[PDB]
Structures are given as structure tokens and as C-alpha cells.
Design a protein around this ligand. Structure first.
Ligand SMILES: [Zn+2]
Length: 252
DNA sequence: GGTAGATCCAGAC
DNA sequence: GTCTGGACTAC
């Protein structure tokens, strides 16, 4: 899931778990547990705590308990569901939080790329994976000025810059490619090569593109198909090590 | 200290 | 078999 989908999860999941008390934590792929490194300590500390809130930072979910926070990233394919402890688990279920009311919060992930970190609440924001996270793309803290400052410093492509979590929180490939198309900028352009006008426009399209989604594609996944604005075949190449889509006529 | 390269996984070719 | 992707290690 990308940022908009994660925000939907935050909103919809919260009322399904708030006020429930954890009675057990079961782990079927320990590699997902990143802190404490020992999955047994992860499970033990959570027991007895009640879910009090659920926040989002970038693509991270932050579950707020009594003393601790659970920081969760779904990567490409992770998903949460709430269901009865009486029913069989769905395939690829790797972590389960069991509540005292006989319901469960289940984490599934076919690829097993997702991560979980638990810390005392007061520490979570100053430890990985939240430490160094850049500003929310929809916040005044992410400004053209901030983007400009980062762009001028680096030798990397503009795509690489936007994918950088320290620059802006949780802005993924689909939105990078779409935002760059909408801003008329080739993804392979050196970030430092962007003019003030291009930075301003890119910021505007980033906020618009992801803002629209949080509340229909031009290039992403459209290789070999006509651009919706000029009819030129959309191309796909590798940029910043990732599959990257663009129109060679609309973007410069 | 900034950056490329490496990494994890299993489904799609 | 090869390719793919979000967010330490070593040049
Ligand atoms: Zn075009």
C-alpha cells in the first residue's frame, strides 16, 4: 500500500481496536520483528496493554498503547484485518495480536517485507524507523523551500530525491512518476538541474497528486500505451534503480 | 558525510 | 533462470 492507502487503514482500523486489551501476541515470521530484536521480548511487553490510539507517519502506522508504541510498515503487500480468534487464519498471516474480547488484529504479507518496532512511547520518534523521517507531504513543513534546499545539495536524480524518506515522508514510486509527469519533468533529470520554477511546480503537483489520492493514471504502468495528453507512447526504463514511467514528449 | 550497491522474499516471466 | 521492490554497509 502507498501513503493514501495507509491513511485509510489508520482511519478504518482504529475504531476496530481502540480500548481493546492485548492478551497475547503470536509471531510466525520473526524476521518481521525489528525491535526488540528478540521476538519473545516484543510479544511479552505488549501483553496487558490497551490500544489507545493509531497515528500515521509517512507510510508507517504508529499504534499507541499504554506505555509503548508499535511502529509498523507494510511495504509492498502487507495488510491488517480484525477477526475472531475462532476462525482459521488466512494464508500468509505472520503476526497476530490477540485481544481479551476474543478478537484479533492480524498482519498478512505474502512477500514478508513488512517491519515492526516497539518502543516506549516517548522514545519512538527518536529511534528507527521514525528517526530522520522527513515532513508529511501534506504539511506546511514540506515546502518548496525545503525541497529546493535538498535538490541543490545532491548529485542524484529528481526521482531518487523524491523517493528519499528523509526528504519527504512516504512518497512512493507511483506518485513520484505521476507527479513528475504532471510537473513536466523527466525523472532522470539531476535534482540540482531543476529551476526554482520547476521545484515550485513539482511541489505543487506532489501535494495535489497525493492529496487527491488521500481524499486516472497518466504514466505509471502505462508503458507502450499512448500518453493521455499527447499520444506519444509512454516509455519505461530504470531510474534510481526502479521501474520508471514517463512521456518523452510531455516531460523534459 | 553523501551515495551506490546490497538486501529481503516469493510471484511473474 | 531472471527480475522486482522500501527503507544497512562500505566506497
Ligand atoms: Zn505526453
Amino acid at each position: 500500500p502507498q501513503l493514501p492507502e495507509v491513511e485509510t487503514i489508520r482511519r478504518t482500523l482504529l475504531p476496530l481496536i481502540v480500548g481493546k486489551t492485548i492478551e497475547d501476541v503470536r509471531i510466525f515470521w520473526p524476521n518481521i520483528i525489528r525491535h526488540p530484536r528478540d521476538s519473545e521480548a516484543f510479544a511479552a511487553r505488549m501483553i496487558g496493554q490497551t490500544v489507545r490510539g493509531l497515528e500515521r507517519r509517512g507510510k508507517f502506522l504508529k499504534f499507541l498503547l499504554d506505555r509503548d508504541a508499535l511502529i509498523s510498515h507494510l511495504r509492498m503487500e502487507g495488510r491488517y484485518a480484525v477477526a475472531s480468534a475462532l476462525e482459521p487464519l488466512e494464508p500468509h498471516t505472520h503476526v497476530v495480536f490477540c485481544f481479551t474480547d476474543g478478537s484479533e488484529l492480524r498482519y498478512r504479507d505474502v512477500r514478508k517485507f513488512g517491519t515492526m518496532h516497539v518502543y516506549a512511547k516517548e522514545e519512538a520518534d527518536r529511534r528507527p524507523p521514525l528517526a530522520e523521517l522527513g515532513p508529511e507531504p501534506l504539511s506546511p513543513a514540506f515546502s518548496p523551500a525545503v525541497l529546493a534546499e535538498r535538490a541543490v545539495k545532491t548529485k542524484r536524480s529528481v526521482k531518487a530525491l523524491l523517493l528519499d524518506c528523509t526528504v519527504v515522508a512516504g512518497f512512493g514510486n507511483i506518485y513520484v512518476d505521476e507527479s513528475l509527469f504532471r510537473a513536466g519533468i523527466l525523472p532522470g533529470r539531476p535534482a540540482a538541474s531543476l529551476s526554482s520554477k520547476e521545484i515550485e511546480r513539482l511541489h505543487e503537483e506532489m501535494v495535489a497528486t497525493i492529496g487527491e489520492a488521500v481524499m486516472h493514471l497518466y504514466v505509471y504502468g502505462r508503458q507502450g500505451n499512448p500518453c493521455k495528453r499527447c499520444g506519444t507512447p509512454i516509455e519505461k526504463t530504470v531510474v534510481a534503480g526502479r521501474g520508471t514511467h514517463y512521456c518523452p514528449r510531455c516531460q523534459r
